[PDB]
Design a protein around this ligand. Structure first.
Ligand SMILES: *[B]([O])([O])C1=[C][C]=C(S(=O)(=O)N2[C][C][C]2)[C]=[C]1
Ligand SMILES: O=S(=O)(c1ccc(B(O)O)cc1)N1CCC1
Length: 245
């Protein structure tokens, strides 16, 4: 179409500039990776996955029968960092709320030995989980690049990960976050709150009406008093500017 690549690049860069952060959004169309934003060198740098790891945590737990999709993880009655976590929920509900405590219970059921083997088997990021089964995705040592995250999303969107088809479909059902004029957006957000600087992620794919799937990964620096929803807003504006939604 008739908009120049120079104009697309400038527009998407301006979304990051206007949020007063530094970031990149990687788009994959077929095999071709396109990098946009205001800090392109972030594309092959390593960051903690933070809550984007919930996608893989869920695959591993379901594959290894550590939970079912209808199982209700009970709230233990203790005060949580966020009040909306103070309730009983399924893995899918916990995905949408990014309820760390539920996914920490799942990681503990899986256990360190099995978790390390599965993370190696999938070859996710730097593949190192260290010795602490319940926080390795939050504070290190596990790290991943935005290129690696968009390639993970590409794999999951096309059922190419080494898990059963049914497992992948169950996790994909948990990730629907927006529907825009016949396009569906499947994604998981991430916010590394226990690292400095703090990393923000939104990793997923657009499923267009025609069936084509376009993976993406947004990566940026989360700064003092930014809203979580800036990740979503920059992402939707960028995908809209490119005509993907
Ligand atoms: B996630 O990236 O959406 C996510 C990570 C960490 C936290 S947390 O710092 O509030 N937490 C409770 C124990 C670690 C929330 C969300
Ligand atoms: O995705 S999160 O990191 C997240 C964290 C903070 C906000 B906010 O108050 O603007 C939104 C989402 N998360 C923790 C609970 C959901």
């Amino acid at each position: 179409m008739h908009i120049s690549s120079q104009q697309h690049e400038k527009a998407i860069k301006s979304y990051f500039d206007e949020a007063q952060t530094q970031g990149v959004i990687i788009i994959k169309e077929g095999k071709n990776l396109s990098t946009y934003g205001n800090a392109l060198a972030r594309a092959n740098k390593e960051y903690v996955p933070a809550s984007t790891f919930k996608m893989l945590n869920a695959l591993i737990g379901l594959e290894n029968h550590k939970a079912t999709t209808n199982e209700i993880f009970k709230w233990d009655g203790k005060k949580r960092t966020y009040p909306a976590w103070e309730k009983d929920m399924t893995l899918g509900e916990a995905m949408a709320l990014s309820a760390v405590p539920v996914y920490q219970e799942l990681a503990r059921r899986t256990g360190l030995e099995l978790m390390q083997k599965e993370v190696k088997r999938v070859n996710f990021g730097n593949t190192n989980i260290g010795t602490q089964v319940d926080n390795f995705w939050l504070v290190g040592p596990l790290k991943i690049t935005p290129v690696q995250e968009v390639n993970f999303a590409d794999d999951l969107a096309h059922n190419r990960l080494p898990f059963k088809l049914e497992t992948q479909e169950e996790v994909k059902k948990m990730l629907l976050i927006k529907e825009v004029n016949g396009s569906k957006i499947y994604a998981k957000s991430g916010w590394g709150m226990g690292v400095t600087p703090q990393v923000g992620w939104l990793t997923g794919w657009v499923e267009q009406a025609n069936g084509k799937k376009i993976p993406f990964s947004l990566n940026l620096e989360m700064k003092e008093g930014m809203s979580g929803s800036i990740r979503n807003e920059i992402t939707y504006k960028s995908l809209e500017n490119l005509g993907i939604i």
